[PDB]
Homo-oligomer: 222 residues x 6
């Protein structure tokens, strides 16, 4: 069964699922992020309803470590799963850390891991030093005293003392991932605040920003 | 099959489930609420055990937005469910808002909706202006910065940025509803604090109050 | 807040979610259904992957009462939710039954009701007399001896003896509904067999049929 | 805190929860059971709705091992929970088996145990020899080849090969138990068939029987 | 079937599951606890990985009432389950309270009770007076205003106003219990902080302490 | 943080988790499997209790497609997870199929995938041609008509028509995996029947067989 794939017509599907938008914005990247941070997630969420997008929020199990005001960044996706295997990983993890840059917003698909943590004090200190914006973990975190002391926004599901080593393995990073109902791609605009994490597709990020600001200004006057 | 309903004897069931108590209290409504707010929910819960009522608390998934002291009000019930249909609703929603009065305590059955919110900044500002006591949502809330700034007690399950429009529809209000194990009827005494939300049937609300105060005074002396 | 809806641009969303396809097929309706019944659900599922549709199957909790071969029909959608209210309903239910016609495939959204049943012996006998194709209930069924004796395909979640009266209420029918990840609209082609229930959007039903038959013939020769 | 219990008025609660009905029936016990076995569980369920009883069915997770016709018996309640402790138990188990008599219907509350089984080949052979009617286990069973060969009706949740020894312990038997929404007391009439298990309180069992038979005869003529 | 147990060889299993370590430490008990309280749970968790122990943390559903720094104590295990039976209990409860001593850390297996609470204001005041270290409840708590005012560390799952009386019963205490993936025995070292509760087997508690301190000192220098 | 791993002592952990037993049996492989197929899973499960092994059964969500008698094979482990990424996989899948040999028993960890299937008609026909014994999928299957016609034992969780392509990706095979509470390694003896799937560690497989046969013979005489 290698002729079965050739019997299929998957070119349109591969482009739809694995295609990444290299679209440039009419404004600077930091200006785009700063202007998004002047909006609530609910307001941006309602705007994307007008674009017929109803499943852009991370699931309700995701909660912020503090009652944050809006923080915006560009998606850096990570994919892991519970795994008994221990060896390896350094090749994936060390290469992954080198690709994390300033203004990245980590979005981590843990394959619904409920036993271990994927983000702790070392990851937080590394992300702070690289000037990342925040991290959204669909799973466990630990070393929360160190995380709080670092003043680094973190969105998570639960907290436990079990480490990742010997319990999970990273399999991919900077690929499209799916958490809850929303698909996240590298470079998407990620917005998080007191009411969770929101995903804005990069192709409409500038248009969604202008529409959200336009709604915000009309509400004050009306 | 319209003779099947006539073949049934449902008069006793309809009165038991849909019957509303129009009982008046020997004291003023605001005095009843104020005296209930001098009691912990656990103390009132134990008293209703003596009335053979073991399922009067909202389920443990309900949590307060702040570590509230006791807040009491009269139940204003709302019923919604996830729904793809968008149009309509204004007839239900505008009529519903007009019936919300001072000292009401909103109890919202969302049909276990886990994707959208039913209570946000607009509902909170509306409830504050009408001098409602609190709101208990078996589901999602958003605009939490606005909710906290309004100093309005809110009990909820989760937080997410998805709005209700296009994801849920209100089907009924001011009818008997069931959340978890407890049935809530309009006019029931609703008590909420740091340990969740409690339902006191209106027919025994005054007797439960006197018994709870009597227990409270005997504990101090013994 | 009635100017807020006028401040929104929801025309595109309403058409996308509530729009129904009145597309006619190049073949007779019964020929379309019969040709779909010569295909497995997995084969039709793989074809819609080529259309970039990955969430067209009813959730895995849906199981067939018997190990059926493929049965196809046109979607008749029903929406209900758990409800304490008893009175009314006849207006909704009697009008609903009159609209069920030959070759309809009932798809019932129960709002994840886990306490009562929505389909029993009376509904089955009614559906058999009207020459419906099958029924898919995202919830409970009962009178299974009568259902099996009627030779009527039924897909369901669980079985329990609690009836719908006094525990649930129908709120809508023949509207778009959402069960699991898939949205079902009236007139969609519904295909069910031993491996669950599948939804084919009416707008591509004829093209999906030809592609599925083309794949089936190429597999035999290769 | 031993004066706190004396400060409470729990006599009414203890009688309501722990009181057992010693009511005799106007007919023989075996005639009562045989006449109940001529009715479907859904029909008896609807009759108890007229008695304002809406939560008399075992939860939908309970399923029959075979598509049984109606089997009726008198409730023999058992209570266990997952437990690491191994020693003891014989005092509880041997005394428990001696109290199982003819026409008993075992209803087993396992405290939602999902790791081990409470009913296997030895219990089935013991129940067959004592002429019990059936067994309803809110948990796991095993030795299913032996159970099927014994022709003994069994209602259960799941099947697994883990035994009870070293994983669970029986703590009580012949006491009131609660499974799902229904409370079961010793001597209650237990009815099970293809659509699950149903509980009829002993105090109304004869009146429910006459009403169910009356409904059944009126349906045939109308 | 009393020869079946004699046919089994369970001596090794009984010693493994019910055996309690009476090992003495080379240092004072309070010095062992104080030195453990200078470590984070994640650091001690990683050390026990070197001992091939990967399931020593309480499940992620356990959360602290406050963002505690490390608190350590010796395990006092309690086992309860939901139960309709009310009478008795005083014999178990009064004897249980007398055995709670200074520096005990209560670990309570509630058999996954989701309806009632096992720890409130009276238990907290009793534990404070006996100089217990903390309490970990795999279930509900109430009287949280009193708990917070007592400055007593509490780890829990949810909060609700339903009391234990009439809804649960204690069946055992000071026996081996299992919560989530971890087995807890009396005398085990229990460590809790902002990231949950951790179990250190008493037999390796001193060796785990020295290794954790050795790792901590090497990290500062490297 | 590459010195942190060198600061750890993980050699004992890696050998415990990733070590594979190359132990040879005193009898032929097919004789070992045939003699295991003369035993029920519950009997072998009880024997491993004497070895202090209480978590050797696959979780209760695993069910057989037919009421099988005992089938035994050597574990061939597979690991996958839900994934949006489509490309690749052939390198993993084609190499994986070449390593499947006669008398293998596939045990598939899907990372709790609830949306897609991992085993269908093509995998079944491939496994039949290679003379595999059975397949245990902790997830979805499809093409069940083809599976039943092939007379190939299959243990699974649910059935759905969604294929694996575009919804999951295989990441590892022939590594240690963990499903539920049990860890499965390549070469372990896998036993499945009407009551689920059981894992016998290869190091004790021959001793467990002799003890199980000894118990079986003593039961007939006593």
């Amino acid at each position: 069964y290698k002729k079965e794939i050739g019997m299929m017509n998957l070119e349109k599907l591969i482009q739809d699922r694995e295609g990444i938008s290299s679209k440039k914005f009419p404004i600077e990247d930091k200006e785009l992020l700063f202007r998004y941070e002047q909006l609530y997630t609910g307001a941006v969420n309602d705007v994307m309803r007008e674009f017929c997008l109803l499943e852009q929020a991370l699931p309700g199990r995701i909660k912020p470590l503090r009652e944050y005001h809006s923080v915006a960044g560009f998606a850096f996706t990570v994919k892991s799963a519970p795994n008994v295997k221990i060896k390896g990983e350094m090749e994936y993890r060390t290469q992954m850390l080198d690709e994390m840059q300033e203004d990245h917003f980590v979005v981590w698909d843990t394959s619904r891991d409920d036993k271990a943590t994927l983000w702790g004090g070392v990851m937080t200190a590394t992300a702070k030093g690289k000037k990342l914006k925040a991290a959204c973990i669909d799973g466990g975190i630990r070393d929360t005293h160190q995380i709080l002391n670092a003043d680094f926004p973190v969105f998570y599901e639960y907290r436990i003392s079990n480490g990742s080593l010997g319990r999970c393995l990273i399999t991919h990073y900077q690929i499209p991932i799916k958490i809850g109902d929303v698909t996240i791609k590298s470079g998407d605009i990620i917005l998080g605040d007191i009411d969770g994490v929101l995903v804005v597709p990069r192709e409409i990020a500038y248009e969604v920003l202008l529409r959200s600001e336009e709604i915000r200004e009309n509400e004050k006057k009306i």
